[PDB]
């Protein structure tokens, strides 16, 4: 059991329609996509940053490592 002992709720009316009287994926453009953007927008700056900051560290350390393999002529201008 679990439905009916949940919480004290008063004065709230809700209206909904049978799934067959409405659209499965309504307002894809006018409503849908805009919010998809809204949301993307909202987070982009909390998420992306540290990810990009890692990418650098990756690229840097990754190449710096390669650089340590190549030879430095300044070791042989001595013979």
């Amino acid at each position: 059991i679990h439905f009916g002992n949940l919480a004290r709720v008063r004065h709230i009316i809700t209206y909904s329609l049978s799934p067959f009287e409405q659209r499965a994926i309504p307002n894809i453009f006018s409503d849908a996509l805009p919010n998809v953007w809204r949301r993307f927008s909202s987070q982009v700056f909390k998420v992306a940053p540290p990810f990009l900051g890692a990418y650098l560290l990756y690229s840097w350390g990754t190449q710096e490592f390669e650089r340590l393999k190549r030879k430095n002529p300044a070791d042989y201008e001595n013979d």
Binding site: R8, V9, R10, H11, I12, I13, T14, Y15, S16, L17, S18, F20, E21
Partner: protein
């Protein structure tokens, strides 16, 4: 309905239910615009009931 003569009744009507119609539109029983049914729900919650 009861102990009444259709006659004596139909007459009383003729007498107090006069006002005859001139045009045809007065004899026109207007048809009503259809009401559309919709599978849905309304929930009025009050746990205090």
């Amino acid at each position: 309905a009861g102990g009444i003569s259709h006659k004596e009744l139909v007459d009383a009507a003729r007498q107090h239910f006069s006002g005859v119609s001139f045009t045809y539109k007065e004899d026109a029983v207007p048809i009503l615009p259809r009401c559309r049914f919709t599978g849905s729900e309304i929930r009025a919650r009050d746990d205090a009931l």
